[PDB]
Each structure stands twice: as structure tokens, then as C-alpha cells.
From Swiss-Prot, chain A:
S-S bonds: none
Entry protein name: Elongator complex protein 1
Free-text description of this protein's post-translational modifications in UniProt: Phosphorylation promotes the tRNA modification function of the elongator complex.
Function noted in UniProt: Component of the elongator complex which is required for multiple tRNA modifications, including mcm5U (5-methoxycarbonylmethyl uridine), mcm5s2U (5-methoxycarbonylmethyl-2-thiouridine), and ncm5U (5-carbamoylmethyl uridine). The elongator complex catalyzes formation of carboxymethyluridine in the wobble base at position 34 in tRNAs. Functions as a gamma-toxin target (TOT); disruption of the complex confers resistance to Kluyveromyces lactis toxin zymocin (pGKL1 killer toxin). May also be involved in sensitivity to Pichia inositovora toxin.
Entry similarity comment: Belongs to the ELP1/IKA1 family.
SUBUNIT field: Homodimer; dimerization promotes ELP1/IKI3 stability and elongator complex formation. Component of the elongator complex which consists of ELP1/IKI3, ELP2, ELP3, ELP4, ELP5/IKI1 and ELP6. The elongator complex is composed of two copies of the Elp123 subcomplex (composed of ELP1/IKI3, ELP2 and ELP3) and two copies of the Elp456 subcomplex (composed of ELP4, ELP5/IKI1 and ELP6). The Elp123 subcomplex forms a two-lobed scaffold, which binds the Elp456 subcomplex asymmetrically. In the complex, ELP1/IKI3 interacts with ELP2. In each lobe, ELP2 is tightly sandwiched between ELP1/IKI3 and ELP3.
Deletion phenotype: Loss of mcm5U (5-methoxycarbonylmethyl uridine) and ncm5U (5-carbamoylmethyl uridine) from tRNA.
Full-length numbering of the shown residues: 919 to 1349 of 1349
Mutagenesis or variant effect for residue 290 to A: Disrupts dimer formation and elongator complex formation but does not affect binding to tRNA
Length: 324, 325
């Protein structure tokens, strides 16, 4: 004599009378309906429907009714509570679609929800539409959306600019986004030396140098770019000795399913270093260390040529300047 | 009775007498070896070897000798004309490798040659190493390498900066390189309103706004970014109508129609990241409805695409939660 389907069906037409009939004539236990149907009858229609819909598990529908109760232009602590509890932010958002002041209330609780699930970008956008900018900036930060953060920081919190910049620079650096981190050092902390050093870890010697020159700090060409070229040189040289060293050795091994996969991974690491070496070769030429330029370009073509015994490959963009 | 290999091999050892011997025993025509053997004897040993090398066609060895005729004096005009005629810039570069002064002479002729064969970058790098910065800049500009160009116009030619900047912008723009062009408007012409507009044209509303804000010209938000968000909205909106309109017809309907429906699946994936930026730009400007429609319309397509592609590799659209309802 458990609760049956006809009882539930009737309740879902919002017909308490028909649902009484059904319960009585289905031998359902009065200890499991009369109190409820009593409570149902003691409520106004809107709230009665809410309770029904809640009971039946139709939470979207429940939310709709509940939000029709208060005809003052607000969103009640009840609606807010019911939305958090049943994860109904999207529906709430759709409900209040044509009432912006109300919609904003769901937006505010959603951003909090979004934020704590580490969806920081959406949290940030939402807070920002609500004009809650300290919270938006904070979330753009955690998203590592630095342009969005600094944009709020410069316009609404200029006294926070340095702090946010420093923090963003620290996490952009850790994420190896050196060009982004350098942009901030230049433009927001007015740190030219630091910026130039960072464009160099990105192999953007072209940028680093135009920056030290536009800043009217020509000395950084020798203080910073040059040593960075030295570093880039050494980092790429040793890598090419390492590749020729592993390839010459891997041939005199296959003479082991994994040996033939290590070679294919060296091709991937190579093709990834390629854009950087091109930049190293050109930065080396433009600073007249042309023997070092020559060596880098040769050693690369060499290893690339040696991938003829490959029993796929790109060509290395030689610069004619150092091709002899 | 015909010039032969033995005579040439002997010439190649720089032995005129053994050449003479070989030539006559082999009964070659005296008119085709005597006037030439004479000229070798009429010249100095180093030039002698040069002419021999020219004749056999070994132009690399030729220059080697001809470049030893003057030492340790500088590069002769004889050596230069010989490089431009037999294209041994690379080889000239190799001989003069340990002597920087001389190598520099070969770089100057190489640069001109490069810059005549459209290779403007290598041309510029050469010119830059030679302190010929005016020439370097022009070649960087031809190569659309604007950062190298301004780096020179700022340090050595301050009067020229506004004219290169303006010229480059014009190039870059036609090349559809809107962000680059904008950077120049911003940094070198102090034209903030223009840089902002261009950033928008590249769907980079994020750079657009931060530039307006940083420049302390907030009005450009309403003045430029907003209408740009309008343009971006309508362009992507109309495009999505097309795809829905296209497919729905191409669905009903040989080898042609099926390949053009595969061209949409790439025009969409091309348009997706820009769509995102438009959706995200719209939300930040509080245009929720417009944002919502773009994201719906886009998803609508990808879903419809996900069905009928089978009945004929679709990557889903990155939604923002702000406008997913």
C-alpha cells in the first residue's frame, strides 16, 4: 500500500481533492498523506503548487512558482536558498531573463558558486556585469586573465595596480608565459630591465631590443639582450649535441619497440625548438656575433640532414646571411 | 682534332708545359690552344691559375686565387665583379670568414642582390650588420618586419618615424594584420582611437578596452568598443544563419555538395574563437541578450551539424555559464 503513481499524477495536476480520493481508494496509509494534503490546503495556490512540485522532484517548476509568490520587485531569501540547494542557477537566470534587477541577484550567487568551483573566468564576467569589481578583478587574476584584471585595476583601483601586476607577473612567469609577464613589467610596473630580460626567455630578442631602445635605455642591449643570446645559444647548442648524440647512438642500437619511438619524440622536440633557433640565429646576426650564428644554423641543418637515415621532417629556414 | 679531356686535366694541375705537350700529341687545332697558352704565360702565377680555373668552370677555386692576388690589401674591384657575375656570394663569405673587414665587402653586394630577389629580411640583417641602417630599415619595412624597422627609426632616424609608421600601418592593414597595425597607431602615432578600432576589427575586444582604459580615454568604450561589438555580433550572427540555411538545404539534396558541407565545418571552427571573444565582449559590456543569442545560434549549428554529419570530427563550442540558459 505504498505511495502510488496515481496519487503522484493527481498531485501533479495541482488537484488536492482528486488526490485525496485517489489515496483513500488505493489503500494508501493515512499517516503518509493527510498531514501533507492538509498543509497543501492551508496554503495559497502559488505556494501550494510549489510544495507539490518540490515533493514530486520538479525543482525547475517549483522554482518558477516560488518566484511568483512575492510580487514586490525583489528576489526573496527563499528563492535564493532554493536555487543554491537545487543547483538551479541556469533556470533562475532564464526565469528572470526580462527583469535585470532580479536576474542580477542570481548572477551574484552564481558567481560565488562559479568561483568556488574554480571557474574563475565566468565568475569574473558575472561579478563584472554586476559592477562588483573588486571581486571581478580578483577572479580575473585567478583565471590569469591579466588584461581583464589590469583593465579593472587601472580604472577603478589605481592604488592596487602594482600589487595585481606583481601577482600576475609571478603566476604568468610560473606558467612560462614570458611575453605576457614582460608586457606587465613594461606597462604597469615600469620595469624595463625586467621586461627585456623576460622577452629574452621567450626568444623574442626582436621585441626585447625594440623595447630597450624605445625606453631610451640602449645599455640593456649589452647588459641584458647579449647575455640572453648567450644563454639561448648555449641552451640550443647543448640540445643539438644531445640530439645528434642520441640519434647516432640509437642507430647503433637498432643493429627496442621503444627505441623507434624515442627517435620520433626527438623530431617533435626539434620541430618545437626550430622557431626559437631561427630567432637565436637572427638575434645573433643583428648583434654581430656571426660565428655563433653560423654554428647554431649549421648544427641544426646538420641534425636535420642526418634525419635522412629515417628508415615527416620539415626544412630549417636558413638565413642566407650565415649560410656558407 | 678536338679539344679533349687530357688537355683540360693538365690545365687543371696548373702545368702549362704538360698541357702544351698533351695538346699537340693529341693533334688539337693550334688555333684553339696556342693563343690561350700564350695568355697564361703572359700573366703572373696567381692570375694564371685564375684564368685556368675560369676556363674549366671551377668558379669557386677561381675566386680563391683571384682573392689572393691582393694580400693583405683589401678586396679588389676585380673580385667583386666576379662574384656578381657567377653568384659566389656564399663562397666569398666563406673565404673572408676569418677576416671581418673583407667579409663586410661581400655582405654589401649580397644585400643588394638579396633585396632584388625579394628576400628583404636577410637583406636587412646584412645591411644592419654593416651599419647601413637607412638601407636596413627600408628592407625590414619591405619584409613587413615592423619592429625591426621602428627600432631603427627611433634610435637613428627620429624625423622618419611618423612616415614609416604610417606606411607600415597601410601595408599591415591590407595584409589583414589588424593587431600589428593597431600597435603602431598606439605606440608611434599616439592615435589611441585608431588603435582601439583596429583591435576590435581583430575581435580582440580585450586589448581594445585595456588600451582605451590605460590611455585614460574611457569614452572609447562607448565610442568605439561597443559599436565594434555590434559589428562583430552582426557578422557572426549573419554567418550562422548562412550555415543553418545552407546545411538545411544541402541536407535535403553529388560529390560537390558533400565537400562544401565539409568546408563549413572548417569555416565554423575558424569563426569559433572569434565568436567566443564576441560572446565574452558582449557580456562584459552588459549586452546579455546579444551574447546569449550568439552562443545559442552557434551551439544550434554544431548540434544540427553533429546529427547530419553522421548521416552523411565536430568539436563542441566553449560555453560561458553566464549566458547558458
Amino acid at each position: 500500500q505504498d505511495v502510488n503513481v496515481v496519487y503522484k499524477s493527481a498531485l501533479s495536476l495541482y488537484d488536492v481533492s482528486l488526490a485525496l480520493l485517489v489515496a483513500q481508494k488505493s489503500q494508501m496509509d493515512p499517516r503518509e498523506y493527510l498531514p501533507f494534503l492538509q498543509e497543501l490546503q492551508d496554503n495559497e495556490p502559488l505556494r501550494r503548487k510549489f510544495l507539490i512540485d518540490d515533493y514530486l522532484g520538479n525543482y525547475e517548476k517549483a522554482l518558477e512558482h516560488l518566484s511568483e509568490i512575492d510580487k514586490d520587485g525583489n528576489v526573496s531569501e527563499e528563492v535564493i536558498d532554493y536555487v543554491e540547494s537545487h543547483d538551479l542557477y541556469k533556470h533562475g537566470l532564464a526565469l528572470y531573463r526580462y527583469d535585470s534587477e532580479k536576474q542580477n541577484v542570481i548572477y551574484n550567487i552564481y558567481a560565488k558558486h562559479l568561483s568556488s568551483n574554480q571557474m574563475y573566468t565566468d565568475a569574473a564576467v558575472a561579478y563584472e556585469m554586476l559592477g562588483k569589481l573588486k571581486e571581478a578583478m580578483g577572479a580575473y587574476q585567478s583565471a590569469k586573465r591579466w588584461r581583464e584584471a589590469m583593465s579593472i585595476a587601472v580604472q577603478k583601483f589605481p592604488e592596487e595596480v602594482e600589487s595585481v601586476a606583481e601577482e600576475l607577473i609571478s603566476s604568468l612567469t610560473f606558467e612560462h608565459r614570458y611575453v605576457d609577464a614582460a608586457d606587465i613589467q613594461l606597462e604597469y610596473l615600469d620595469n624595463v630591465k625586467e621586461a627585456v630580460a623576460l622577452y629574452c626567455k621567450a626568444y623574442r630578442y626582436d621585441i626585447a631590443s625594440l623595447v630597450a631602445i624605445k625606453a631610451k635605455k640602449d645599455e640593456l642591449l649589452e647588459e641584458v639582450v647579449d647575455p640572453g643570446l648567450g644563454e639561448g645559444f648555449g641552451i640550443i647548442a647543448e640540445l643539438l649535441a644531445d640530439c645528434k648524440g642520441q640519434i647516432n647512438s640509437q642507430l647503433r642500437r637498432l643493429r627496442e619497440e621503444y627505441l623507434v619511438q624515442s627517435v620520433g619524440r626527438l623530431i617533435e622536440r626539434l620541430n618545437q625548438t626550430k622557431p626559437d633557433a631561427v630567432r637565436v640565429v637572427e638575434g645573433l646576426c643583428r648583434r654581430n656575433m656571426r660565428e655563433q650564428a653560423h654554428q647554431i644554423q649549421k648544427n641544426f641543418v646538420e641534425v636535420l640532414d642526418l634525419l635522412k637515415a629515417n628508415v615527416e621532417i620539415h626544412d630549417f629556414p636558413k638565413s642566407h646571411i650565415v649560410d656558407f
